[PDB]
C-alpha cells in the first residue's frame, strides 16, 4: 500500500496551513504562467493571420 | 465592382421577385398620379430590406 | 390609521396647532428671507 | 475572555457581524443580491476614482477628456468600460433586491425597507448625473429633458430648475456640478448602506417560507461566505462577460457624439436603470400630472408595507400574490421597453395601460388577493 | 447583545450531521436536479411564465401596427381617390 | 344564501391550501404566519406541545429549504387538517389589544 | 416618421467572441479613410499610431505621418515653424474649424469617424449599408441635388457625395478595389479605430471566459463542502415524554 | 428665571442672523454666477443674413 | 435516552473511501 | 421601556453618546478642539463641494477656473477664501489635539 | 504618482480626485477614532479617574 | 466696472463699446465683431 495521490499530497502539504499557504502562493505563480500560454495559445489559434502578431512579416525590415 | 454584382443576385431569388410586384406597382401609380401624397419610398423600403440582407452574407466572401 | 382616530383626542391637536401655529410661523420667516419677494419686502 | 482577538479590539468586535452572525438556513439564492450591492458600491468607487484620476469636467475637454482615457491611458479602457457596464449590474441587483423584499415580506422590516428606499433613490441621481459627464449627445439632452421636467411646478419650479442649472442652460456651469455629487454621493451613500445594515443586524434575514427560523440558524461564516464569495464569481463574470465580449451592447445609448446644442435625437432616453421613469412620465398628457406620477412611480415603494393584507408575510404560500408578483415584473419588463419607443400612438396607448397595471398591482390587486389567501385557508 | 445564545429557545430536538471530508459535495446531481429542477419549474411556470408570455405577444402585435402604420403611408387613406 | 357558491369555495379553499406552499411544505397553516407583536405573544402562549412542534416543523422547513428539497409525497400536510392552532390563541391577543385601544380612546 | 431600413448582420471576421480585428483589411481601410474620406471627415482622437494596432512599423508610419503633417502639418493646428517629423500630432482636421467644415458641405457638418460605427447606433452594418446603399429616388419624389436618396438614413435623405466608387484609390498589395470590397475595408479600420480597447478585449475575455468557467466550478464544489453539513444533517423531533 | 430664558434666546437670533446670511450665501454661489449671467438677457444680430434663410 | 436512538444512515452522504463499517476510518480519512 | 425615542430606534440609541455619555467635569478649554476638529472637517467639505461645484481640474482652466470663482460667481468667494483659510483652522486645531494629548497622557489611549 | 514625467495634466487630475475623495475616508476614520476612546471616556488635567465625578 | 466703478452701464456700455470697435473680438476670432457687447474681457495686447 501507497497513500493515494491525494493523501500523499495532504500529509505532504496541507497538513500545516504554513504549507498550504506556500503551496497556494506557489500555484497561482505556475498556474497563471500555464493558463496564459495555453489559452493564449487557443485563442491565437482561432484568429490565424487575423492578427498583428501574424502580419509583423509584410512590412519589417525590408 | 464586387458590391454590384452581388446586389442583383440577391433580387433574383424568388422572394425578392415576389416583393418587388409592390415596388413596380408602386412606382407607375405614383408617377401616374404624380400629385398624389402616395410615396413610393415606402414601398422600396420592403424590397431593400429583403435585397441586403442577402447582400450581407455573400458580398463578404468577395472583399478584402 | 383607525386606532389613531379617538374621541378624547382634541386637547393635544389643540396643543399641537399652537405649537404647530408657531412652528409655521417660523418657516415663513425662514422661505421669506431666502425668497425675498418684492412684496415680501414691501410689508 | 483573554486573547480572544475579536472582542479584544472593540473594533473587531463590529466586524463580527460577518463571522458570528444568526443566519437563516433555508434562503433562496436572491439573497446573494445584498451582498453583490455592495460589491458594485465598492467597485464603482475604485473604477471612479480611477477615472476620475484622468477625466476633466469642462465642456471643451470632457467628452475628449474620456476618449483620451479611453485610448492613451493604459488599461483606462477597460476600467471605463467596466465602470460604465458595472452600473449596469449595480442596478440589475437593485432590482433583484427589491423583487425579494416585495415577494416574500423583508419589507415588514419598515425602518430597514425606508433605508432602503433611501438607498435606491440615491443611487438613481448618481447615475442619472455621472451618465452626463461624459457630455455625450445622449447625455447632453437627457439631463436637460429631465431637469427641465421640474419646471412643472408652479410657483418654484422655473425658478429652482434655473438654480439646478447655474444658469439657464446646461453650460460648463451645470457639467462641473454633477461632476461634484457624482462624487460625493457614493461616499455618502457608503454610509447608507452601513446604516441600512444596522437596522437589518437587529431583527435577522426573512426566509421563502417566511417564519421566523430561530429554530434554523447558522454560522454566517462556514456557509455563507463561500456562497457570498460564490456570488462574486457569477456577478463578475457578468460584468466582465458585458465588459469584455459586448461593451456597448447593454449600453443602448450609440452617441458617443459630442453634444451640439442644437442638435437633437429625436429619440431621447434614460438608460436601462431610468428607462421606467422616462415611460411614466409619457402616459400623462399633462406635465405635472406627469412629474407627480413619476415620482409616486418610485416613491410608491414606501407604501407596500401599509398596503400588506395577508397573515403570511410570505408570499410562498400564496399562489395568486406569486402571480401577480411575476406580472408586474413583466409590467415592469414592458414598462422598460417603452422607454426606448417612440412617443406615438402604439406605445402611448401601451404605456398607459402599463402605467395603470403597474400601481394596480400595487396599490389595489395584491393587496386584495392577500386577503383573499387569507380568507381561503380559514385564517 | 448576544445572537448565538439568545436567539430562542428549543427542546428536545436532535440533529445528527457529517464531515465535509466524510462525504461527498456533490449528491447524484444530475438525477435530484432534473426531478427537482423539474419539478419546482413546474410549479413555477404556471405562476411565473403567463405575464412574460403576455408581453411577448404585446411586443410582437405592438412592433408589427408600428411598422405597418408607418411602413403602410398608404394605410390611413388610399391612394387611388 | 350561500350553498352553491360556499361550496364551490369550500373546494376552492382545499386547491387554495394546496395551491399555497404550507400545505405542500407539509407545516402547519397557522405557524406560516408574519411573526408580528401579536403573533408574537399568541406564540408565546402556547403549551409545550403545540409550541415544539412548531419548532420542529420549521426546523424541518427550513432544511428543506436549505437543501431545496421537497418531502415525500406521502408525508405532506393535507388541507383537511387545518389545525388552526394559533387562530384560538392569536385572536385574543388581538381582542385584548382592540379593548386596550378602546379603553385608552375613552 | 419615415421607417427606417437596417443594416444586414454582415459577415465580419469578427462577429464572434473570439474573433478577432484582421489588420490587413485596418490597414486598407486607413488608407480609404485617409485618401477617400480624410477630405471632409476628421477623426480626433486617433494619432498616427497604427505601428503595431495596424501593423504599420514604426518607420513605417513615421514616415506616413510626416508627409501628413508636411502638407497639412502644424500649420493647420498653429505651428508656424513645423514640418515633417513628429509622432504625437493627431489626424489633420480637414477644417480650421467646423462652421467652415459645414460651408464647404453647405449646412452639412461631416461627422468625425473616430466613434461613427461605435456613435452611429446599429455599428458597422449600417455604415457599410449606408455607402454601398444607394438606390433609385421612388417613384413620385423629389430631391434637392444635395440632398441624394440614401436607402438607409433615417430622414430618408443625406448629403453625401459619391462616398465610394469602384477604383478610387489603389492599395499597395493589389486587393481588388471594389466600390463594396473598398467599404469591407474601410468599416473594418473605423471598428478597429471606434473600438480599440475592444480587440483587446475579445482576446481578453477568451482568457477570462475560462478563468472563470473554472473557478466557478470550484466554488460550486467548494461552497457545497462548507454547506453539506447542513444539508447532510437531519432533525428528528423527540417527543418530551 | 425670565432673564436666564431671555438670555439664551438672545443667542440664538444672533446665531440665525448669521445662519441666514451664512447658508443664503452658500446657496447663492451655487445657484448662479456673473459669468454666465453676463451673457443671459444679451443679443442683437441683424441684416448679415439672406433676405430668405433662417439663423 | 440519547443512548436508546441509533442516529440516521449517512451512507448515501459517506463517501465511498468511507463508506464501508469494516474500512478503517482513519485510513479513509487521511485520503478523504 | 415605551416611547423612549432614544432606544427606541436602533439607530437613535447610537445618538447618545453625544448627549447621555459620562463626561469628565473639571476639563480644560484645551478639550474642545476634538469638536472643533470635527466642525472643521465638516465646513471643508460643504465649501469643497461648492468649490468643485464650479472649479475645473486641466493645466489650461483650473487657474482660471479658481479665478473665476472668486469673480463672478455669486458669493464664491468668501467660499473659495473660506475654504483656504478653513484648512489653516483645520491644522491649528490639530496641533491643539495632539498637544493636549502629548501634555496630559490622552495617548495612553 | 506623476503620471508622467513632469506634473502636467496626469498629474493635476489626480489630485483632484484623491482630494475629493480622501475627507470622505477620513470621516469613517474620524468615526472609528471616536468608537475606540467611546470605551474609556476622556483623561483630565489631574490626570486621575473622574467616574467619581461624571 | 458699472457699479464697482460708478461709470454707468451706458457710460460702460459706450466705454466698452470702443474698445471693441479697435481691438474688438477680431483678435480674439470674432470675424465680424464690432461695438456693443459688454461680456467681452480687455483685449489682449497681443495674439499670444
Ligand atoms: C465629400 C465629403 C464627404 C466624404 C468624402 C465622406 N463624407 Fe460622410 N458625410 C458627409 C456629409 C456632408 C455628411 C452629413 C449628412 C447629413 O447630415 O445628411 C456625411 C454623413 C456621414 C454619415 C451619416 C451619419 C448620420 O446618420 O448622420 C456617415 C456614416 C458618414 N458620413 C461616414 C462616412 C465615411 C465612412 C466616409 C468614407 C468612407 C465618408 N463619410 C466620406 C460628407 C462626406
Ligand atoms: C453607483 C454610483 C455611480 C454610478 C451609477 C456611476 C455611473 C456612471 C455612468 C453611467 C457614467 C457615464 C459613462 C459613459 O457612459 O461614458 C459615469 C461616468 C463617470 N463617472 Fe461614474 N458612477 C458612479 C460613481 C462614480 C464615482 C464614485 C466616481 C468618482 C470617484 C465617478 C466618476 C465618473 C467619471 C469621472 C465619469 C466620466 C467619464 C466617463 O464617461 O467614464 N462615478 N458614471
Ligand atoms: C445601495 C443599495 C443597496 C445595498 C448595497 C443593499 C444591500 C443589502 C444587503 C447586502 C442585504 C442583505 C441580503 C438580502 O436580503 O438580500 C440587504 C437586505 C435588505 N435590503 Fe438592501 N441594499 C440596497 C438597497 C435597498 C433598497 C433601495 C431597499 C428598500 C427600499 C433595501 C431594503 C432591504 C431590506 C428590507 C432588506 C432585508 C430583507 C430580509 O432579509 O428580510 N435595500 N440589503
Ligand atoms: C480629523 C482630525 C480629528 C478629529 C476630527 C478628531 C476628533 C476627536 C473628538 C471629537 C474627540 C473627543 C473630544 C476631545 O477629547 O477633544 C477626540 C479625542 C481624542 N483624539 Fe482626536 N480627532 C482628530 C485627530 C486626532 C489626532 C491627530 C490625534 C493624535 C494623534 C487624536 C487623538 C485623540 C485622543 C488621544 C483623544 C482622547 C483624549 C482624551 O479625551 O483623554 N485625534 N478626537
Redesign the interface.
Given at each position: 500500500v501507497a497513500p493515494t495521490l491525494t493523501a500523499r499530497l495532504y500529509s505532504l502539504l496541507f497538513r500545516r496551513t504554513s504549507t498550504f499557504a506556500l503551496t497556494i502562493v506557489v500555484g497561482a505563480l505556475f498556474f497563471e504562467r500555464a493558463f496564459d500560454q495555453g489559452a493564449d495559445a487557443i485563442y491565437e489559434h482561432i484568429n490565424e493571420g487575423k492578427l498583428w502578431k501574424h502580419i509583423k512579416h509584410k512590412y519589417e525590415n525590408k | 465592382d464586387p458590391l454590384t454584382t452581388v446586389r442583383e443576385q440577391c433580387e433574383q431569388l424568388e422572394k425578392c421577385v415576389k416583393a418587388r410586384e409592390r415596388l413596380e406597382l408602386c412606382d407607375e401609380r405614383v408617377s401616374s398620379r404624380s400629385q398624389t401624397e402616395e410615396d413610393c419610398t415606402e414601398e422600396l423600403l420592403d424590397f431593400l430590406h429583403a435585397r441586403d440582407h442577402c447582400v450581407a452574407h455573400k458580398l463578404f466572401n468577395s472583399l478584402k | 390609521l383607525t386606532?389613531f382616530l379617538?374621541?378624547?383626542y382634541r386637547q393635544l391637536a389643540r396643543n399641537w396647532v399652537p405649537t404647530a401655529s408657531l412652528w409655521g410661523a417660523v418657516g415663513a420667516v425662514?422661505l421669506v428671507?431666502?425668497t425675498d419677494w418684492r412684496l415680501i419686502l414691501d410689508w | 475572555m483573554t486573547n480572544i482577538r475579536k472582542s479584544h479590539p472593540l473594533m473587531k468586535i463590529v466586524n463580527n457581524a460577518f463571522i458570528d452572525l444568526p443566519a437563516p438556513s433555508n434562503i433562496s439564492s436572491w439573497w446573494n443580491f445584498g451582498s453583490l450591492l455592495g460589491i458594485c458600491l465598492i467597485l464603482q468607487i475604485l473604477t471612479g476614482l480611477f477615472l476620475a484620476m484622468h477625466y476633466t469636467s469642462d465642456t471643451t475637454t470632457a467628452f475628449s477628456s474620456v476618449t483620451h482615457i479611453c485610448r492613451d491611458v493604459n488599461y483606462g479602457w477597460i476600467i471605463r468600460y467596466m465602470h460604465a457596464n458595472g452600473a449596469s449590474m449595480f442596478f440589475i441587483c437593485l432590482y433583484m433586491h427589491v423583487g425579494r423584499g416585495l415577494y416574500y415580506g423583508s419589507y415588514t422590516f419598515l425602518e430597514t425597507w425606508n433605508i432602503g428606499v433611501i438607498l435606491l433613490l440615491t443611487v438613481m441621481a448618481t447615475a442619472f448625473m455621472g451618465y452626463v459627464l461624459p457630455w455625450g449627445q445622449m447625455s447632453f439632452w437627457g439631463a436637460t429633458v429631465i431637469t427641465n421636467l421640474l419646471s412643472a411646478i408652479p410657483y418654484i419650479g422655473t425658478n429652482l430648475v434655473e438654480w439646478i442649472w447655474g444658469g439657464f442652460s446646461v453650460d460648463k456651469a451645470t457639467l462641473t456640478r454633477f461632476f461634484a455629487f457624482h462624487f460625493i454621493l457614493p461616499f455618502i451613500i457608503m454610509a447608507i448602506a452601513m446604516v441600512h445594515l444596522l437596522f437589518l443586524h437587529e431583527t435577522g434575514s426573512n426566509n421563502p417560507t417566511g417564519i421566523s427560523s430561530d429554530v434554523d440558524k447558522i454560522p454566517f461564516h462556514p456557509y455563507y461566505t463561500i456562497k457570498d464569495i460564490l456570488g462574486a464569481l457569477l456577478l463578475i463574470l457578468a460584468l466582465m462577460l458585458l465588459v469584455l465580449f459586448a461593451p456597448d451592447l447593454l449600453g443602448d445609448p450609440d452617441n458617443y457624439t459630442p453634444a451640439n446644442p442644437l442638435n437633437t435625437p429625436p429619440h431621447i432616453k434614460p438608460e436601462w436603470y431610468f428607462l421606467f421613469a422616462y415611460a411614466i412620465l409619457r402616459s400623462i398628457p399633462n406635465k405635472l400630472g406627469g412629474v407627480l406620477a413619476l415620482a409616486f412611480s418610485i416613491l410608491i415603494l414606501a407604501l407596500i408595507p401599509l398596503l400588506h393584507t395577508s397573515k403570511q408575510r410570505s408570499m410562498m404560500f400564496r399562489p395568486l400574490s406569486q402571480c401577480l408578483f411575476w406580472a408586474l415584473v413583466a409590467d415592469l419588463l414592458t414598462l422598460t421597453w417603452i422607454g426606448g419607443q417612440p412617443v406615438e400612438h402604439p406605445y402611448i396607448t401601451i404605456g398607459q395601460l402599463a402605467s395603470v397595471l403597474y400601481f394596480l398591482l400595487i396599490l389595489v390587486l395584491m393587496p386584495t388577493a392577500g386577503t383573499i389567501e387569507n380568507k381561503l385557508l380559514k385564517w | 447583545g448576544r445572537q448565538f445564545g439568545h436567539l430562542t429557545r428549543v427542546r428536545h430536538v436532535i440533529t445528527y450531521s457529517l464531515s465535509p471530508f466524510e462525504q461527498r459535495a456533490f449528491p447524484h446531481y444530475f438525477s435530484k436536479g432534473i426531478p427537482n429542477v423539474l419539478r419546482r419549474t413546474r410549479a413555477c411556470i404556471l405562476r411565473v411564465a403567463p405575464p412574460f408570455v403576455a408581453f411577448y405577444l404585446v411586443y410582437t402585435w405592438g412592433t408589427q401596427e408600428f411598422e405597418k402604420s408607418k411602413r403602410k403611408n398608404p394605410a390611413a387613406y388610399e391612394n387611388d381617390r | 344564501a350561500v350553498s352553491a357558491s360556499s361550496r364551490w369555495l369550500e373546494g376552492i379553499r382545499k386547491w387554495y391550501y394546496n395551491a399555497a406552499g404550507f400545505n405542500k411544505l407539509g407545516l402547519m397553516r397557522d405557524d406560516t404566519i408574519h411573526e408580528n407583536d401579536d403573533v408574537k405573544e399568541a406564540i408565546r402562549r402556547l403549551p409545550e406541545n403545540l409550541y415544539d412542534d412548531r419548532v420542529f416543523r420549521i426546523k424541518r422547513a427550513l432544511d428543506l429549504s436549505m437543501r431545496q428539497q421537497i418531502l415525500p409525497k406521502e408525508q405532506w400536510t393535507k388541507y383537511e387538517e387545518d389545525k388552526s392552532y394559533l387562530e384560538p390563541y392569536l385572536k385574543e391577543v388581538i381582542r385584548e389589544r382592540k379593548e386596550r385601544e378602546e379603553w385608552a380612546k375613552k | 416618421s419615415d421607417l427606417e431600413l437596417h443594416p444586414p448582420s454582415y459577415p465580419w471576421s469578427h462577429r464572434g467572441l473570439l474573433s478577432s480585428l484582421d489588420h490587413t483589411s485596418i490597414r486598407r481601410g486607413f488608407q480609404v479613410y485617409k485618401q477617400v474620406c480624410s477630405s471632409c471627415h476628421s477623426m480626433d482622437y486617433v494619432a498616427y499610431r497604427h505601428l503595431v494596432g495596424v501593423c504599420y512599423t514604426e518607420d513605417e508610419a513615421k514616415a506616413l505621418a510626416e508627409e501628413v503633417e508636411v502638407q497639412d502639418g502644424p500649420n493647420e493646428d498653429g505651428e508656424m515653424f513645423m514640418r515633417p517629423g513628429k509622432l504625437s500630432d493627431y489626424f489633420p482636421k480637414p477644417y480650421p474649424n467646423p462652421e467652415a467644415a459645414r460651408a464647404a458641405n453647405n449646412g452639412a457638418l461631416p461627422p468625425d469617424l473616430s466613434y461613427i460605427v461605435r456613435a452611429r447606433h446599429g455599428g458597422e452594418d449600417y455604415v457599410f449599408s449606408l455607402l454601398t446603399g444607394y438606390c433609385e429616388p421612388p417613384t413620385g419624389v423629389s430631391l434637392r441635388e444635395g440632398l441624394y436618396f440614401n436607402p438607409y438614413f433615417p430622414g430618408q435623405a443625406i448629403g453625401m457625395a459619391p462616398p465610394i466608387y469602384n477604383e478610387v484609390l489603389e492599395f499597395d498589395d493589389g486587393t481588388p478595389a471594389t466600390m463594396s470590397q473598398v467599404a469591407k475595408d474601410v468599416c473594418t479600420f473605423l471598428r478597429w479605430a471606434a473600438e480599440p480597447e475592444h480587440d483587446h478585449r475579445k482576446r481578453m475575455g477568451l482568457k477570462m471566459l475560462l478563468m472563470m468557467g473554472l473557478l466557478l466550478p470550484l466554488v460550486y464544489a467548494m461552497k457545497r463542502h462548507k454547506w453539506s453539513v447542513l444539508k447532510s444533517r437531519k432533525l428528528a423531533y423527540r417527543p418530551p415524554k | 428665571k425670565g432673564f436666564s430664558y431671555l438670555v439664551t434666546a438672545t443667542t440664538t437670533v444672533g446665531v440665525a442672523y448669521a445662519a441666514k446670511n451664512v447658508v443664503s450665501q452658500f446657496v447663492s454661489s451655487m445657484s448662479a454666477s456673473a459669468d454666465v449671467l453676463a451673457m443671459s438677457k444679451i443679443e442683437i444680430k441683424l441684416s448679415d443674413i439672406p433676405e430668405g434663410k433662417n439663423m | 435516552s440519547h443512548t436508546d436512538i441509533k442516529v440516521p444512515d449517512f451512507s448515501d452522504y459517506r463517501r465511498p473511501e468511507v463508506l464501508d463499517s469494516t474500512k478503517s476510518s482513519k485510513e479513509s480519512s487521511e485520503a478523504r
Open positions: - | - | 386606532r379617538g374621541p378624547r425662514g428671507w431666502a | - | - | - | - | - | -
